[PDB]
Amino acid sequence: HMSAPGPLVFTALSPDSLQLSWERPRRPNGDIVGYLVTCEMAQGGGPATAFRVDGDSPESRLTVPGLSENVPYKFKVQARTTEGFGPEREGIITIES
């Protein structure tokens, strides 16, 4: 999926927050203007948080708070282009300590 963001890289910062990073799509389908990051418990049924990332970068980083430990979170990152959204890159992360 070359139009999708690179694989998500999770850097857990604390019991309740992590940094998510991703490389821009190797082959964007359109002009990337930002990203959409959506976070929710992987098990579903939970609240989702959407983060609108403004702009593009070879690698983008986002700190995502309001998490918890021992709960897998599913992150979905899509490039925002001038024409729409690119395909999602998904990544699941659990923070333990």
Author numbering: 1570 to 1666
Can you provide the manuscript's text about this entry?
The β4 subunit only pairs with the α6 subunit to form the α6β4 integrin, which is a laminin receptor required for maintaining the integrity of epithelia. The third and fourth fibronectin type III domains (FnIII-3,4) of integrin β4 mediate binding to the hemidesmosomal proteins BPAG1e and BPAG2, and participate in signalling. The crystal structures of the individual FnIII-3 and FnIII-4 domains were solved and the relative arrangement of the FnIII domains was elucidated by combining DEER with site-directed spin labelling.
The structure of the FnIII-4 domain (1572–1666) was refined against data extending to 1.50 Å resolution; the FnIII-4 crystals contain a single protein molecule in the asymmetric unit. In contrast to FnIII-3, the region around Y1642 is mostly uncharged. Therefore, phosphorylation of Y1642 is less likely to destabilize FnIII-4 and correlates with a minor role of Y1642 in the recruitment of Shc.
